[PDB]
Design a protein around this ligand. Structure first.
Ligand SMILES: O=C(N[C@@H]1Cc2ccccc2NC1=O)c1cc2cc(Cl)sc2[nH]1
Ligand SMILES: O=C(N[C@@H]1Cc2ccccc2NC1=O)c1cc2cc(Cl)sc2[nH]1
Ligand SMILES: Cc1ncc(COP(=O)(O)O)c(C)c1O
Ligand SMILES: Cc1ncc(COP(=O)(O)O)c(C)c1O
Lengths: 805, 805
């Protein structure tokens, strides 16, 4: 069996079994005769959960007495996934549980498949939060994750008639064994009301209260005995007629009901604003109380990291508390606030920027608006002094945006109230300084940093790709698991026939296992001897699933033109959710399935090309498909993807990347060598030049016969005979309203895809290049990222020293 | 210590402690340093809960293989109270837990005070359901309780400015250690839709589904190793825009949200009808499936007991299922149904009768209405044949009621679709036959029975009055605990000086403990050397808390007239909830407090009379005040209280009763001797005679100067100087619209109260009479009642044989 999954200690197995059987009887109230695989999964989950407890108590108590600086990671999303396997891995219990369940006549992997994702995020930002909690525990940081316990996470996606359908993600249906309710640490949050300016200052009164009930989930570090805490707040009513009043409690409880499924788009829903304030206010009460267990030392004991502008109200909230309740002078309080807070920016796309209507803030959060105006005044006073007479800089830098409706720019608030501002990869971090926050960079250059994203090599290697983890371990030991730069040592195996063999063998095993999953779960058949070409990520125009579609159609039309000409077989897989209200994204999902309907049923094509849409892409599913992937599609328009992290997943798991010089793709290529990446298309510079003279898609259509053909297939109704004009909006958009310049990268992309195939025809040289990629993915460990946060922002030293027993 | 609470086994205590400490660590995730009394209560609850599990599995499996007839107790209410103490008592674990907690430095009674009531009932009917589940387990019956898991039970009553305020009863706030969720046994219930009459018969289609999620609570028998099941169903949504759709799931989930606080009043709310169908449909699916694990044998394997008309839809539901889904012929199905179902009637008051609008049933439950019309037709066909040409009997007996709005009489449906119909005490059961269901009794006399109510001597003696239980045990052993007629043996101790001493000593201890509770919990001071005179029960005109008020005012006015004349000191206590919309009941609560405001602050009165309103009367509080009570107020207007059961509580716990010849008061007096009860006022016969010539309260006012005085105190504003006419509605009602003839029993009552005092001045003879009452309360055991149900209705033999280990 696999040594990286640890020891199956004889007494450990015995004890595991005993405790499994104990929970089944006492916790589940079952005999082996009525018990289902779900009961078996939960008995395991409880048994495994018990091993966290001693460390969870010991860790938190150890922070109480060492009194290190506390890091508070505020996020509206934690995209956690399942936790059974992760717990076993970080606790060295995996092989032991596997044996114990084996002796009881159970298949542990089958049991793991019953666990529901905690899918309390939308995409990258949400998952980064999750990898970050993991890496902070593994680096021995006294770090707390602080969010919302959504009753419903990211919608369950079904595909019906080729179309996405949304169903509620009822993830707490059968209970959550991993969380611990702390109803005794419940806290009041206030909304609405108004401000009384009197004698000991301002007073926020006549508010409506919503209670915040914390639920704590354990966050285990990798084999270091550290167990940190994720605290997620749940909304509760405080204590028409009686019945209606009792039923109307739902209204306040709706605050924590459901994750907003808008990935990188701003919607301006009040219920969202309530969700943001809810998490901010409850969290800060916790931070202060725990601090108190004078505020000059506050930034020496407290860091607040803002995952985007979503918890940006933490800035006026802290000020409110310090000034109104603690009665600090404004200036004192503001020094404290800025040194406490730092802000992570995740995207440059204007429509994802949070700009809340002033009337809304005035109504829901009156005292916060006042405070925000006062912040603006003093901040623009600073601008004016540093740049005398520069009036336009003033209106550009202003927290307040003028227009038919006045709004507050929440990014501006964050920069003003934070000592550090970071982007999430080098290219993105620089553009913040150069253009989009150029003015702020000019006022305070020292605020601006880079922290290039990362993924945890626990989840994203050991967990999901134990076969790859094992052949690496066979060569270089297990230290790389929490020291991922050691993967560099694998470059020395690039001519090693055993390693070349094993790497290819591991990938083929992962492909077989994925095929089996699709057959099991969907009765979908995929050609195992095909290049698995995978684009998985949220469905957006900027991510250009449509470019991928153009290519797929290109391959189909080329096959039909020259049927007799050999092409490398491909299974092209696309997966990802569209926001329920983004019509275009939903049209693109349908187009993917509609291409499959033609392509996958053409006898002339047979098994040399398949196109399939992976339903319900989510963390658990990523862990299945990514280790199976040959080609990693990372084809955003240059300038549009701040970083990405799926890109990193694929690199770590033995896929080659086809991509643009966008986001962290650039650094990955730098790390591996551009010779070892399929880089294509416009650079940022070329996109800009095209914007200066204006993007005319018609030029590209008039000069490329293959593209012209595809577009006429779409228009004429070749991919929807029953509904000839089904795809007119997509055609119109591409021809006349394409913000992401799909046609401009078509040729370079198709050519680059030809090189991909060319290489794939040479298995040895494909695998050698893959080795060059794995060996060089170390930079993309989230431990690396978190240690830069710790040293460059939070001002804490990380550590991988074991806590005792 | 107390031997009736069992043995503190040395290894048992050791093990208890171990397991207490185990749960505190693994279940509560606490160290002894952060732990609160609430954590300590839950560690105990888990520790004690573990002792049910083996018996719960063993009991249910034993029913599977013995395959006895299953009893299904359908009730919209189970008024359970707390379960920690009850579990320890029935498991002989009380003294042991007390010692174990003692060795850990904890007071177990203090820990018990943290447990929230399961207050999922309103009053008598709800509590009878609870005593019944207990007695069925103790009699070894394969009995299932089937109801609704209300998110909110009976409202928490606060008193503010003398007025009742209602607050949500958030009883699941900190978790329910006692219940076990069975989400895997979730079931669909259908609403709305319409009927297709085709080929394999009718088809109910286009329904809206609400899921029913069962939660199972253990029901422990008294020391017989039996643990039966209470199954309570919780409403769940099945799987505007996305967000609103997810939020709109609340609407269906509102079905199980809150108990309707209408005690003995019919309101006609659709949400109520949904609650009734919900419980009926989910329950019957369970019954059928479990039966299947041909339907001629169905009544030999299934009894359905209907606790009032609330689950009366079980009758058309069973028919629906048998006919539409199982495709039995109508007649076959109807024979099955009638032999399965029996109906318990709880009140004769017309306004508590369920008569649902036909339009409502047509809309929510179309197929049920059809079936109900068909039932009516065939049933009235039977009437017509048995009573040819009797047309008015036809419209009187009809399930269908004519009027501006046509309704279905649910009582009529129950009698028609049930093989037995019972009242809840002898007098009530006879009046059903004589008058109110005279016509049905004449068609089918053999259907009509009596089952006089009872209370469990576990909860209502051993649990709540361990001191009384112990001195009884000292004389006659412990067999009486499940064989309550053995209390008769105590009549031989009526001249026993040790027993007389102990009985009085026990009561004084209970009074001290109650005083302490009021001082602790409310800083209310009561004179311990006073006669404790207690009227506790739901606030209603028929129960005549106002008569009690007249008396209290009488005593105050008599004191003030002759200050120097000795009177036996009294603390008069009134407690009970008013329905949020019953204005008059709410006015009566205020009047009680307002009398206290004058009386309790008159220096001339000092501590010789106090009037206090016991806030939040509920099962746990009954267990505190009833063992403390000297005088038990049971003063309903004759003819109006079908049985009562609080009356029985008081008799069992050493109070004397002042009462009318109403409900089970009559049988209690018969059991004890009328010499041993303070019986007063009109009998049913006198009430009737007064109705024939018309009740004129003015006569009573014009002939009784003391009454006249009190009424002028009310009118003139003596009990509300700030608001002189506060009590005008109460005055007007009593003078001109009194349905319950308060003035007609005033004189007899006041005189009878004089005899009460006369006796109380002779402690020995008071206690001897109390002995005569306790000794004769055996008939009022719910085991007795349940065994009559088992033998006379269900057709099963009860048993007190131990199940093994
Ligand atoms: O949910 C937990 N415990 C509760 C406590 C409770 C209180 C009242 C009623 C029932 C229960 N049952 C539990 O399992 C729980 C224990 C642990 C240990 C963890 Cl590590 S994460 C975690 N959650
Ligand atoms: O609530 C119980 N067990 C659950 C099972 C579960 C499933 C998923 C997630 C967490 C948990 N925790 C429990 O305590 C539970 C066990 C028992 C034993 C009883 Cl007797 S009454 C009773 N309730
Ligand atoms: C489920 C899920 N969604 C989104 C992402 C981010 O991927 P990308 O960088 O391709 O948008 C990841 C890594 C993932 O696990
Ligand atoms: C809390 C509670 N309410 C109501 C009742 C019934 O009492 P009564 O027969 O006096 O209405 C009881 C016994 C009780 O425990």
């Amino acid at each position: 069996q696999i040594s990286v999954r640890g020891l199956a200690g004889v007494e450990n197995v015995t004890e595991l079994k005993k405790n499994f059987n104990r929970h089944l009887h006492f916790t589940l109230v079952k005999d082996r005769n009525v018990a289902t695989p779900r009961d078996y999964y939960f008995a395991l989950a409880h048994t495994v959960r018990d091993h966290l407890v001693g460390r969870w108590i010991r860790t938190q108590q150890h922070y109480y007495e060492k009194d290190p600086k506390r890091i508070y990671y505020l996020s509206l999303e934690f995209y956690m996934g399942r936790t059974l396997q992760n717990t076993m891995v970080n606790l060295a219990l995996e092989n032991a549980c596997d044996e114990a369940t084996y002796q009881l006549g159970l298949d542990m992997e089958e049991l793991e498949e019953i666990e529901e994702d905690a899918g309390l995020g939308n995409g990258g930002l949400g998952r980064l939060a999750a990898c970050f909690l993991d890496s902070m525990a593994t680096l021995g940081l006294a770090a707390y994750g602080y969010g919302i316990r959504y009753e419903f996470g990211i919608f369950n996606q079904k595909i019906c008639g080729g179309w996405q359908m949304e169903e509620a993600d009822d993830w707490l249906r059968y209970g959550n064994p991993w969380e611990k309710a702390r109803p005794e640490f419940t806290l009041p949050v206030h909304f609405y009301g108004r401000v009384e300016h009197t004698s000991q200052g301002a007073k926020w009164v006549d508010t409506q209260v919503v209670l915040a009930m914390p639920y704590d989930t354990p966050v285990p570090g990798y084999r270091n005995n550290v167990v940190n805490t994720m605290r997620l707040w749940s909304a509760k009513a405080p204590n028409g007629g009686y019945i209606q009043a009792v039923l109307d409690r739902n209204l306040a409880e709706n605050i924590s009901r459901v994750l907003y499924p808008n990935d990188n788009f701003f919607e301006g829903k009040e219920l969202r604003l309530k969700q943001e304030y809810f998490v901010v206010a409850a969290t800060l009460q916790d931070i202060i109380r725990r601090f108190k267990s004078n505020f000059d030392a506050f930034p020496d004991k407290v860091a607040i990291q803002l995952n985007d502008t979503h918890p940006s109200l933490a800035i006026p909230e802290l000020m409110r508390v310090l000034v109104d309740l603690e009665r600090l002078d404004w200036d004192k309080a503001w020094e404290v606030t800025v040194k406490t807070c730092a802000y992570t920016n995740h995207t440059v796309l204007p429509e994802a920027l949070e700009r809340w209507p002033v009337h809304l803030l005035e109504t829901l959060l009156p005292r916060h608006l006042q405070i925000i105006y006062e912040i603006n005044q003093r901040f623009l006073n600073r601008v004016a002094a540093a740049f005398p007479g520069d009036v336009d800089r003033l209106r550009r830098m202003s927290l307040v945006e003028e227009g038919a409706v006045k709004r507050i720019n929440m990014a501006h608030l964050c920069i003003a109230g934070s000592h550090a501002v970071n982007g999430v990869a080098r290219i993105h971090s620089e553009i913040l300084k150069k253009t989009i926050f150029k003015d702020f960079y000019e006022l305070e250059p020292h605020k601006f940093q880079n922290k290039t994203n990362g993924i945890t090599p626990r989840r994203w290697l050991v967990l999901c790709n134990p076969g790859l983890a094992e052949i690496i371990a066979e060569r270089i030991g297990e230290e790389y698991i929490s020291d991922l730069d050691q993967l560099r040592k694998l470059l020395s195996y690039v001519d090693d026939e055993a390693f070349i063999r094993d790497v290819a063998k591991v990938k083929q095993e992962n492909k077989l296992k994925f095929a089996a999953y699709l057959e099991r779960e969907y009765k979908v058949h995929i050609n195992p001897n095909s290049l698995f070409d995978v684009q998985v990520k949220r469905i957006h125009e900027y991510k250009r699933q449509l470019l991928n579609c153009l290519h797929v159609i290109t391959l189909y039309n080329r096959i039909k033109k020259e049927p007799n000409k050999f092409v490398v077989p491909r299974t092209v897989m696309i997966g990802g959710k569209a926001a329920p209200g983004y019509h275009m994204a939903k049209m693109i999902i349908k187009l993917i399935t509609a291409i499959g309907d033609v392509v996958n049923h053409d006898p002339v094509v047979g098994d040399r090309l398949r196109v399939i849409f992976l339903e319900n892409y989510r963390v658990s599913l990523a862990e299945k498909v990514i280790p199976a992937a040959d080609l990693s599609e990372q084809i955003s328009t240059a300038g549009t993807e701040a970083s990405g992290t799926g890109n990193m997943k694929f690199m770590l798991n033995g896929a080659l990347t086809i991509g643009t010089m966008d986001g962290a793709n650039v650094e990955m290529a730098e790390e591996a060598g551009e010779e070892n990446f399929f880089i294509f298309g416009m650079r940022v510079e070329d996109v800009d030049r095209l914007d200066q003279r204006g993007y005319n898609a018609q030029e590209y259509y008039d000069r490329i016969p293959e593209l012209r053909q595809i577009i006429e297939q779409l228009s004429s109704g070749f991919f929807s005979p029953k509904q000839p004009d089904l795809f007119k909006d997509i055609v119109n958009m591409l021809m006349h309203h394409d913000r992401f310049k799909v046609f401009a990268d078509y040729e370079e992309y198709v050519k680059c895809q030809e090189r991909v195939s060319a290489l794939y025809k040479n298995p040895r040289e494909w695998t050698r290049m893959v080795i060059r990629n794995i060996a060089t993915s170390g930079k993309f460990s989230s431990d690396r990222t978190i240690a830069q946060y710790a040293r460059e922002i939070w001002g804490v030293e990380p550590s991988r020293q074991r806590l005792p027993a």
